[PDB]
Scaffold this active site. Sequence first.
Site, PDB file in Angstrom:
ATOM      1  N   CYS A  30       0.838  -1.196   0.000  1.00 16.42           N
ATOM      2  CA  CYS A  30       0.000   0.000   0.000  1.00 16.42           C
ATOM      3  C   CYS A  30       0.877   1.251   0.000  1.00 16.42           C
ATOM      4  O   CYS A  30       1.656   1.455   0.929  1.00 16.42           O
ATOM      5  CB  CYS A  30      -0.870   0.014   1.247  1.00 16.42           C
ATOM      6  SG  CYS A  30      -1.887   1.509   1.352  1.00 16.42           S
ATOM      7  N   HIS A 106      -4.418  -8.079  -4.180  1.00 13.50           N
ATOM      8  CA  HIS A 106      -5.143  -8.590  -5.316  1.00 13.50           C
ATOM      9  C   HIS A 106      -4.348  -8.351  -6.609  1.00 13.50           C
ATOM     10  O   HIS A 106      -3.329  -7.591  -6.684  1.00 13.50           O
ATOM     11  CB  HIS A 106      -6.517  -7.916  -5.417  1.00 13.50           C
ATOM     12  CG  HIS A 106      -6.428  -6.443  -5.570  1.00 13.50           C
ATOM     13  ND1 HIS A 106      -6.091  -5.833  -6.760  1.00 13.50           N
ATOM     14  CD2 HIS A 106      -6.571  -5.455  -4.662  1.00 13.50           C
ATOM     15  CE1 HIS A 106      -6.028  -4.528  -6.567  1.00 13.50           C
ATOM     16  NE2 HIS A 106      -6.322  -4.271  -5.305  1.00 13.50           N
ATOM     17  N   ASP A 107      -4.837  -9.069  -7.619  1.00 15.37           N
ATOM     18  CA  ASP A 107      -4.242  -9.026  -8.936  1.00 15.37           C
ATOM     19  C   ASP A 107      -4.546  -7.692  -9.629  1.00 15.37           C
ATOM     20  O   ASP A 107      -5.351  -6.879  -9.148  1.00 15.37           O
ATOM     21  CB  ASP A 107      -4.707 -10.238  -9.755  1.00 15.37           C
ATOM     22  CG  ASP A 107      -4.195 -11.551  -9.189  1.00 15.37           C
ATOM     23  OD1 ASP A 107      -3.152 -11.552  -8.487  1.00 15.37           O
ATOM     24  OD2 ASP A 107      -4.832 -12.592  -9.469  1.00 15.37           O
ATOM     25  N   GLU A 184      -9.747   1.416  -4.105  1.00 17.35           N
ATOM     26  CA  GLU A 184      -8.456   2.086  -4.284  1.00 17.35           C
ATOM     27  C   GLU A 184      -8.491   3.150  -5.375  1.00 17.35           C
ATOM     28  O   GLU A 184      -7.861   4.204  -5.229  1.00 17.35           O
ATOM     29  CB  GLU A 184      -7.368   1.025  -4.495  1.00 17.35           C
ATOM     30  CG  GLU A 184      -7.146   0.196  -3.205  1.00 17.35           C
ATOM     31  CD  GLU A 184      -6.739  -1.249  -3.424  1.00 17.35           C
ATOM     32  OE1 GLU A 184      -6.486  -1.682  -4.569  1.00 17.35           O
ATOM     33  OE2 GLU A 184      -6.599  -1.952  -2.405  1.00 17.35           O
TER      34      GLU A 184
HETATM   35  C1  HEM Z   1      -5.954   0.592   7.266  1.00 17.36           C
HETATM   36  C2  HEM Z   1      -5.854   1.194   6.097  1.00 17.36           C
HETATM   37  C3  HEM Z   1      -5.360   0.533   4.823  1.00 17.36           C
HETATM   38  C4  HEM Z   1      -4.985  -0.733   4.613  1.00 17.36           C
HETATM   39  C5  HEM Z   1      -4.927  -1.921   5.578  1.00 17.36           C
HETATM   40  C6  HEM Z   1      -4.575  -0.818   3.220  1.00 17.36           C
HETATM   41  C7  HEM Z   1      -4.150  -1.959   2.569  1.00 17.36           C
HETATM   42  C8  HEM Z   1      -3.816  -2.073   1.236  1.00 17.36           C
HETATM   43  C9  HEM Z   1      -3.474  -3.284   0.526  1.00 17.36           C
HETATM   44  C10 HEM Z   1      -3.439  -4.664   1.142  1.00 17.36           C
HETATM   45  C11 HEM Z   1      -3.230  -2.960  -0.748  1.00 17.36           C
HETATM   46  C12 HEM Z   1      -2.812  -3.870  -1.899  1.00 17.36           C
HETATM   47  C13 HEM Z   1      -3.896  -4.103  -2.962  1.00 17.36           C
HETATM   48  C14 HEM Z   1      -3.246  -4.461  -4.301  1.00 17.36           C
HETATM   49  O1  HEM Z   1      -2.942  -3.432  -4.974  1.00 17.36           O
HETATM   50  O2  HEM Z   1      -2.972  -5.654  -4.697  1.00 17.36           O
HETATM   51  C15 HEM Z   1      -3.385  -1.537  -0.887  1.00 17.36           C
HETATM   52  C16 HEM Z   1      -3.284  -0.845  -2.048  1.00 17.36           C
HETATM   53  C17 HEM Z   1      -3.589   0.467  -2.216  1.00 17.36           C
HETATM   54  N1  HEM Z   1      -3.884   1.378  -1.206  1.00 17.36           N
HETATM   55 FE1  HEM Z   1      -4.109   0.930   0.764  1.00 17.36          FE
HETATM   56  N2  HEM Z   1      -4.762   0.426   2.623  1.00 17.36           N
HETATM   57  C18 HEM Z   1      -5.244   1.268   3.579  1.00 17.36           C
HETATM   58  C19 HEM Z   1      -5.591   2.574   3.363  1.00 17.36           C
HETATM   59  C20 HEM Z   1      -5.405   3.303   2.218  1.00 17.36           C
HETATM   60  C21 HEM Z   1      -5.784   4.699   2.036  1.00 17.36           C
HETATM   61  C22 HEM Z   1      -6.521   5.544   3.076  1.00 17.36           C
HETATM   62  C23 HEM Z   1      -5.383   5.067   0.812  1.00 17.36           C
HETATM   63  C24 HEM Z   1      -5.476   6.401   0.105  1.00 17.36           C
HETATM   64  C25 HEM Z   1      -6.324   7.356   0.406  1.00 17.36           C
HETATM   65  C26 HEM Z   1      -4.781   3.900   0.192  1.00 17.36           C
HETATM   66  C27 HEM Z   1      -4.384   3.810  -1.110  1.00 17.36           C
HETATM   67  C28 HEM Z   1      -4.115   2.637  -1.776  1.00 17.36           C
HETATM   68  C29 HEM Z   1      -3.957   2.548  -3.223  1.00 17.36           C
HETATM   69  C30 HEM Z   1      -4.202   3.622  -4.230  1.00 17.36           C
HETATM   70  C31 HEM Z   1      -3.619   1.137  -3.500  1.00 17.36           C
HETATM   71  C32 HEM Z   1      -3.411   0.497  -4.867  1.00 17.36           C
HETATM   72  C33 HEM Z   1      -1.958   0.328  -5.261  1.00 17.36           C
HETATM   73  C34 HEM Z   1      -1.811  -0.293  -6.631  1.00 17.36           C
HETATM   74  O3  HEM Z   1      -2.794  -0.784  -7.202  1.00 17.36           O
HETATM   75  O4  HEM Z   1      -0.676  -0.275  -7.148  1.00 17.36           O
HETATM   76  N3  HEM Z   1      -4.823   2.835   1.068  1.00 17.36           N
HETATM   77  N4  HEM Z   1      -3.758  -1.026   0.336  1.00 17.36           N
HETATM   78 MN   LIG Z   2      -1.694  -6.527  -6.076  1.00 15.58          MN
END
Ligand code: HEM
Ligand SMILES: [Mn+2]
Length: 299
Positions: A30, A106-107, A184
Site C-alpha cells: 500500500c 489482489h491481482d 483504491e
Molecule cells: C488501514 C488502512 C489501509 C490498509 C490496511 C490498506 C491496505 C492495502 C493493501 C493490502 C493494498 C494492496 C492491494 C493491491 O494493490 O494488490 C493496498 C493498495 C492500495 N492502497 Fe491501501 N490500505 C489502507 C488505506 C489506504 C488509504 C486511506 C489510501 C489512500 C487514500 C490507500 C491507497 C491505496 C492505493 C491507491 C492502492 C493500490 C496500489 C496499486 O494498485 O498499485 N490505502 N492497500
Molecule cells: Mn496486487
Amino acid sequence: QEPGSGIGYPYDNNTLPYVAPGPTDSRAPCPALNALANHGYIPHDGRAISRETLQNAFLNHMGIANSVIELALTNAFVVCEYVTGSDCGDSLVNLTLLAEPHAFEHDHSFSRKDYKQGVANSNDFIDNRNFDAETFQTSLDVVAGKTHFDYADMNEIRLQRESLSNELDFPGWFTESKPIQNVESGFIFALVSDFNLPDNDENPLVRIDWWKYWFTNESFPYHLGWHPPSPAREIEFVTSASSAVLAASVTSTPSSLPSGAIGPGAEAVPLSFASTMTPFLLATNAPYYAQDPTLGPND
Ligand code: HEM
Ligand SMILES: [Mn+2]
Ligand SMILES: *[C@@H]1O[C@H](CO)[C@@H](O[C@@H]2O[C@H](CO)[C@@H](O[C@@H]3O[C@H](CO)[C@@H](O)[C@H](O)[C@@H]3O)[C@H](O)[C@H]2NC(C)=O)[C@H](O)[C@H]1NC(C)=O
Ligand SMILES: *[C@@H]1O[C@H](CO)[C@@H](O[C@@H]2O[C@H](CO)[C@@H](O)[C@H](O)[C@H]2NC(C)=O)[C@H](O)[C@H]1NC(C)=O
Ligand SMILES: *[C@H]1O[C@H](CO)[C@@H](O)[C@H](O)[C@@H]1O[C@H]1O[C@H](CO)[C@@H](O)[C@H](O)[C@@H]1O
Ligand SMILES: *[C@@H]1O[C@H](CO)[C@@H](O)[C@H](O)[C@H]1NC(C)=O
Ligand SMILES: *[C@H]1O[C@H](CO)[C@@H](O)[C@H](O)[C@@H]1O
Ligand SMILES: *[C@H]1O[C@H](CO)[C@@H](O)[C@H](O)[C@@H]1O
Ligand SMILES: *[C@H]1O[C@H](CO)[C@@H](O)[C@H](O)[C@@H]1O
Ligand SMILES: *[C@H]1O[C@H](CO)[C@@H](O)[C@H](O)[C@@H]1O
Ligand SMILES: *[C@H]1O[C@H](CO)[C@@H](O)[C@H](O)[C@@H]1O
Ligand SMILES: *[C@H]1O[C@H](CO)[C@@H](O)[C@H](O)[C@@H]1O
Ligand SMILES: *[C@H]1O[C@H](CO)[C@@H](O)[C@H](O)[C@@H]1O
Ligand SMILES: *[C@H]1O[C@H](CO)[C@@H](O)[C@H](O)[C@@H]1O
Ligand SMILES: *[C@H]1O[C@H](CO)[C@@H](O)[C@H](O)[C@@H]1O
Ligand SMILES: [Br-]
Ligand SMILES: [Br-]
Ligand SMILES: [Br-]
C-alpha cells in the site's frame, strides 16, 4: 517534513521527516501505509500497529477520515489472523503480511506486479508487494501527455491493468478484484484529485504529477502544491468515486478482459478465510525506497 519546516502548515501542524525504510523494516503493498511508515506516523519499522494509530495517522497527516478506513481495518486484521494463524488483537503484526495474495492484496494492481506474473513454473512467485516502476508506467501510459484525468480515464487504466495481468499471469492465477481495486481507485481521487479546481467534489480530476510522486516516492507531494484534503475525505466520496469509475463509458476496450470486467462492481465486504486454508508464502524482498533520486527529510 521536519517539524519546523512548516511545509504542512496550516493543514498538518505536526509533521515528521521522511526516513527511508532499512532492510529489516516491514513495508506494505500500500503506497499510503508506506508513506505513513516512512514518516513515523505509524511505526517506522512497520510492526505492531494499532487501529487508533492508523486512524490518527490517516486523519491528521493525510486528510483521510476514520470512515474511509473502517472496512480496511477489519480486513487488515482478518488477514493478520489468516497469515499468522492467531488473532492479532489490536496490534497488527506487520505491514508485509498485507501482501498475502488473493486476499486483501489482489491481482491487476496499478503499480505492483502479480504474485504469479510472468513466472515460468506454477510454484514460482514474485514480489507482488514493492512498488514496480514498469508496472506503474503501464498505468501512466494510458494517460500519457496529460496533467489530469477523470473517472472514465481511470476506468480505462484499470481495464488495461486487468488485460495485461490476465495475459501475463501464470495460467489459472489471475483473479479479478473489481471491488477492492475500485475502492483504491476512489482512494486515488480522494487523496490526489485537484482540490484547487472549483468543481472538485462534483467532478474530481487526478493530478498525475501528485499521483506519481506519492506512488514513486512513498512520501507526500507538498513540493507540487499538494496538502491533506480539508475537510478530511469521508467514505461517501470514495465509494461514489468507485461507482463512477465503473459506470464510465468505455471508449477503448483491451483484449483479454475477464468476464464481466466492463460494468458495475460488487460492494466491498469483510474478507473471510477458511480456518483450514494455509496462507501463501509472502514475498521476502527488502522494502523498496526511491533511489532516482533518493529523498531528503523534507521530500
Ligand atoms: C488501514 C488502512 C489501509 C490498509 C490496511 C490498506 C491496505 C492495502 C493493501 C493490502 C493494498 C494492496 C492491494 C493491491 O494493490 O494488490 C493496498 C493498495 C492500495 N492502497 Fe491501501 N490500505 C489502507 C488505506 C489506504 C488509504 C486511506 C489510501 C489512500 C487514500 C490507500 C491507497 C491505496 C492505493 C491507491 C492502492 C493500490 C496500489 C496499486 O494498485 O498499485 N490505502 N492497500
Ligand atoms: Mn496486487
Ligand atoms: C511479517 O509477518 C509475517 C507473518 O508472521 C512474516 O512471514 C512469516 O515469516 C516467518 C518467519 O518469521 C515464516 O516462518 C517460517 O516458515 C517456514 C515455512 O513454513 C518454516 O519452515 C520456518 O521454520 C519458519 O517458521 C513464515 O513462513 C512467514 N509467513 C508467510 C505466510 O510467508 C514476515 O516475514 C514478516 N515480515 C517482516 C518484514 O517483518
Ligand atoms: C520524488 O521526490 C523527489 C524529491 O522531492 C522529486 O524531485 C524533486 O522534485 C521537486 C518538485 O517535486 C523539485 O522541486 C526538485 O528539483 C526535485 N529534486 C530532485 C533531486 O530531482 C521527484 O520528482 C519525485 N518523483 C516523482 C516521480 O514525483
Ligand atoms: C526474500 O528472501 C528469501 C530468503 O530469506 C529469498 O529466498 C527470496 O527469494 C527473497 O529474496 C529477495 O530478498 C532478499 C532479502 O529478503 C534478498 O537478499 C534476495 O537477494 C532477494 O532480493
Ligand atoms: C494549524 O495552526 C494554525 C495556527 O494556529 C491554525 O489556525 C490551524 O487550524 C491549524 N491546523 C490544524 C489542522 O489544526
Ligand atoms: C458509495 O457507496 C456506498 C455503498 O457501498 C454508499 O454508502 C455511499 O453513499 C456511496 O454511494
Ligand atoms: C458521489 O460523489 C462523488 C465525489 O464527490 C461524485 O463525483 C459523484 O458524482 C457522486 O456524487
Ligand atoms: C454508483 O455511484 C456512481 C456515482 O454516483 C454512479 O455513477 C453509478 O451509476 C452507481 O450508482
Ligand atoms: C475514449 O474516451 C475515454 C475517456 O472519455 C478515454 O479514456 C479513452 O482513451 C478513449 O479516448
Ligand atoms: C484504448 O485504450 C485501451 C485501454 O487503455 C487500450 O487497451 C486500447 O489499445 C486503446 O488504446
Ligand atoms: C470496447 O468494446 C466493448 C465491447 O466490445 C464495449 O463494451 C466498450 O464500450 C468498447 O466499445
Ligand atoms: C468501489 O465502491 C463501489 C460502491 O460500493 C463498488 O460498486 C465498487 O465495486 C468498488 O468497491
Ligand atoms: C468467513 O467466511 C468464510 C467462508 O468463506 C469462513 O470460512 C470463515 O470461517 C468466516 O465465517
Ligand atoms: C538521498 O540519498 C543519497 C545517497 O545515495 C544522496 O546522495 C542524496 O543526495 C539523497 O540524500
Ligand atoms: Br514481524
Ligand atoms: Br511479465
Ligand atoms: Br465485481
